[model samples]
Target: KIEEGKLVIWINGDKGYNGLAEVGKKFEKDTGIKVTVEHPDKLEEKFPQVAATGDGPDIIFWAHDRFGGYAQSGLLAEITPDKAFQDKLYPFTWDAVRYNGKLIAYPIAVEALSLIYNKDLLPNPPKTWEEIPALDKELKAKGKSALMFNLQEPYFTWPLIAADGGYAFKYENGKYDIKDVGVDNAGAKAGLTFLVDLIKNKHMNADTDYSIAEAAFNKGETAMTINGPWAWSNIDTSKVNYGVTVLPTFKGQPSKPFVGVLSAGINAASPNKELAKEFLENYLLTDEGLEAVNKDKPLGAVALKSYEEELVKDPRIAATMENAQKGEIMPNIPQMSAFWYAVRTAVINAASGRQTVDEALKDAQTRIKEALAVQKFFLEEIQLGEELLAQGDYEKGVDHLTNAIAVSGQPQQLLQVLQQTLPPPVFQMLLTKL
Candidate 1:
């Protein structure tokens, strides 16, 4: 049996995987249990299916955002670390993994955005939003753009929204209150208005996306950009001398970015739950394990407090840590999925001048609530349909399934879910019956 003294882990093929494999070897040697590490191309997309089969890996290494969905779907083991063990990690890291008042993953690293500026082009970066217009004028005289970013992405634009006190949800008593959405609040409208002005004045472009922005910055076409440490590896540092600092202030307050935590979660379906838990809490969370992981992938701030002093010696990591310190943890609830798409549409509408800031945000809020309601209805129909099918009530089963397809927004999504969750023969039989 795969579970008999054997532990399996699935991870993405990044530098972190190398560190995990190294640690797995040590764990194997010390405990006489074989540890298998698999690097899958689309780990996130395939993970839910693997877990449902009751044959998934003992542990899955990924970002904290998915932990909430997995926990709600009963795919992850709720972690119960001792108070001392919990205190060893940063408070923000803990917040990143907590969903429904339970910790579902062990956070390893923290990432956030900072202002990356061309040293030669602008020796001194702007300190406030008011300074950007003049800087854009100076760059325009030299036939260059002053600032650029992925205009279509909400993750990149959230700092502007938050600068004026906008938030996705109100956090109270250690939980995000979904009913208290603030995307269309007065503060959000103020933030979007500033962004609209930037686009209107040609300081930034609505057509710019991630690839275009990064390419422009690397080729020295833009004076500054807002991005995280992951972009550092792609920049030709020798060609473009750049310095990193905290995001410039809006009005008088710093633009707060979202702090993302990379973490490892235990599979709830794993037969070797105790062994996986032991390895994670006692071995992987230790100083030695952290050092091994950070040695190769020093791309972000390590979540473990013990490694902070050592990591900050590098200027890049130090700047990233500083930005993370001033940032807010991205909410790890399932509701965030709706929040992302809504904010993206709002930013695009306001920046493109297709709608006023207030109109755009209000539309976004309305759409988000409608989309979430549709999601809830779809889930209920699918659940009831499957239960009826299993109970041999063919007529009622087909009726519910038809309603599910009607409300699902697309037929392919329902088919994809069935393909992922059911055996091939069973899926084909169900299709024929329908």
Candidate 2:
């Protein structure tokens, strides 16, 4: 057994460290294991830098996007929470953390995109996408746009596309069918066409971006825009009297945005694994613990439904959570990289009039197919390196990993993972080779 000393955790965002610290103080008093909560605004670069190494923190507090990468790269430990504890959480929480069929993280904050509209403009948020045309007429008459968003981004544009049944990838049976590329499907055509029509009619701009869209809404230049909880602080800071609600419907189908969870995961290489698990299961997931966290940070809908009203007081959280149930958990897999790049290009071309919506989407489909095929080679390189490492071979392992990086389009990701898992001698030698 590891000695009971100190447990370290890295959390995202600015609020909640003191509240988490309060629980830590009591925890240390009771269990004799000291706890430190570090409120870090960023961790993407540094986390994978040290997580698989001896200097890593015991727990990671962050979003779900990188869980699959962290888990597959051997940085996160698989967790098995008690069935009783699991039952208290929203069922979708389980889906967010599962990678290669392993539960690798515990969900904390549940968030989704919703419409934020100026209350003074038209009273309530639009109930349907069809309402946009009428609102456009009214707002345009007043020298303002009816709706605006970052049309070039898949994340922001997903609501519009999803309304017509469009999807980037196919998910089924608790796993993504990466082979099934759907951006060129009929649903996608219909969805992209909607945006094209909006631009054609001068309702919104093809060049709108997050900064541009948010700035316009805050200044009352637009009536409505779609965003998630992350934008709440900025929105609240602005003087606009805005109301938040689920995205408007399209052709009688409700808009479903992607759901993302901010979660915590124990490190695979941590010696204090058991202690970390005990602290999480017995302390952090409890009412007092959640109350403390919420006191410091008013998180959107938390993963635990048991603490609903008592823990979450923000209406923005409620609306987004309500919509989260209607959405899909963004897929976590190696193949996701291909989807993002393809869609980004597809939207950029389609939105800019460089190509018709049909041409852009078909091009995106071809891009994804070729990307997936090439992904296999880099994957084979990295997988073979892991196999070498498993057998206690570092030199050949680093060689193959370096070749994997050389052959791949992105380099820093695997390089960081390799740095942590290698011995000092081999790592220093690898540096010179670099």
Candidate 3:
């Protein structure tokens, strides 16, 4: 009873074709909705272009990391969750899908990071971040660096900063309030200081890239490293008996590494929208469908019930689930573009010995402050300009507005206001006629 017409679904890559095929087969059998899935090698390059052109796939499988960008670009279609569904989901997972009061994507599977340690080198992972340095001393006495982290990658550093109760961007109102960025906050400064101390004490290294770090760990050159479940396949248990455990806490608070959710979303422009929705509704929601994703992706699944019943019984998978309980979503907001890049640059600068960690973060804080200054100035000018107009001083107001924009920078606030207030044709006509 499979449907006659084909609904084209796109996957980001070809890493799990058989699993997807099985899901598609089940979906077709149950709903009679035939799905043709394609894994385009150039998906990363093509996503923005496809979204820009409104020619993307009916359904796409992608990571939560890109949700912020897609939602901000207006490329994602918002979906309303059933009240029951909304109630059942993990709070942070729900927050991940929400951007500006809209649900841009649905969560399918979540992955949390854990400290994977060489058991022979250290029988127990450090229980806290403060203990890491001491552990490093012991390891170094034995001639091995205690730990490794990607200082060049904000994806890794941000959570560490947060572990110490610091954040690069503060969430306020409905969006990321970069105006109150806390990269240089005392907690963040302390967090960065600790990292720098680690490097200086020969407890950690900045030059360790993914391959180098993995190779070093495999060869037993490093004592421990924090990585997600996706890395389970690459770990050589034969040569080195390694164990996975929860991330070390700081101040008795667990370091909640950002949870990444992999999901499939229907394209806004798909001709087969209804059919695609029907296909995923039946396939993506059922136990069979959840099993498809879990089977294909070793470290992921949507149904927490089934995940506990079938998946968590495996000790390796259980460790990931135990860690997932403490996970938080990587913030999905447009402004995260500026937030993460600035943070990465600062951390890298500190790690490279260019500046003290505190100084580098102070620089990042200054940069965020300057960006928000321009935004704030423009907002104030728009308000002042409206006040002048009300007083019938149009020429004076316009002049003041112009100077304010030139000195402080572009009037993004005004652009946002106009974009919101003006209708398409009316705004266009004003441009054309004026």
Candidate 4:
């Protein structure tokens, strides 16, 4: 039985893990419950296996994006915060943690992309997309690009898409309807056209990946770039006098980036449910605990209003919070996995002028649908194979397992799942038979 004597929490990211360790020590001192904080490499890939086998930590410290998949798989405990706790957090933070109208975690921090600019080059950040072209022309004559970002990546370009009213899925009635894809709409096409124009005019190019873009900004080759708080530490403040602001507007609308929330979730299979609940609700959500977690890193705009106020005292934190407040929470549904690659391909094709905007987006939509279907098929086959094996139908199980192996896009993924689900002897026997 899980008792008050001991508790375990899994966390990732160097700065985030260190901050949590401080809070864990304090919780241990106050409650007399020994706390073990673990930072597992590749936590995202390994978590599902560990949690399924009932060897997972009592609590998981991670982002809200994985909550939907984990909750649907019955891996997470539903969270019920009191009115007081609810009131302390920003409403959007709460929304980010909800899966199917039920809270799956306690929201901790919020992050979003913003324009980080060199103050010396431009006295003020550009207020609208219209200003960027003129700025680019002026900078080119001086041997610099006015702005540069990851040209081949969708995450960096999504704000531009959204500024013109494009969206991955239509959100309504408390759920994102995957059927309502808007990536190919007129608004998105216009956004794509604007980006292509930049490439055509020699303002930016397809060769600018993340490393190159960051290097350009840091080395003073570019006046501005779009990035998050995580990149602040890498900037050489002495060489580049920098400031942060919201992304430029398109038409009259503000560019909207994806807001990501970091949260703490309890394992449904935890032996000490009550203790785990107590730690998450009482200690971790408190002012002291919140401050402990933010003091060292301060990478995010904390969800708690009071802690948020303290964090925004730093100008960089203030800019991130400003963007997050105006940003759309990244969709946390399982379908989002299909959106990433499809949108990236579309962005690359359209930006490079390899295809028309409409053609690129249409192809992306079709690819997303196809990918989701394949993923669903693979999951169903694996489940059926496992069930048949459990019922002593070894031959039928082997047939279904072989079919699953064939349909799986990546063999390594199937191997990883089988390694954790099957007994060693059975797994080896199945492999040899196949």
TM-score of each candidate structure, all chains considered together: 0.75, 0.73, 0.71, 0.74
Candidate 1 whole-model C-alpha lDDT, 0 to 1: 0.80
lDDT of 1 by residue, 100-189 (tens): 788899888888888989998999988887789899998999999889988887878888778888888889996678778889998778
Which of the two, 1 or 3, has more TM-score?
1
The reply for model 3, stretches above 4 Å from the true place, is: 1-50, 55-69, 80-92, 133-144, 171-178, 218-220, 236-240, 251-253, 275-279, 300-304, 313-327, 370-434
- Predictions in order: lDDT: 0.80, 0.79, 0.68, 0.80
lDDT, candidate 3, 349-391, per-residue tens: 9988998887898888777676657666766876786677578
The TM-score between candidate 4 and the true structure equals 0.74
TM-score of structure candidate 2: 0.73
Which of candidates 2 and 3 is the stronger one according to TM-score?
A: 2
Candidates arranged by lDDT, highest first: 1, 4, 2, 3
- Tell how far residue 421 is off in model 4, in angstroms: 14
Candidate 2 accuracy as lDDT: 0.79
For model 2, the superposed segments whose C-alpha errors exceed 4 Å read 1-62, 80-88, 233-239, 269-284, 287-298, 309-318, 379-434
RMSD, each candidate, Å?
A: 5.6, 6.1, 6.5, 5.5
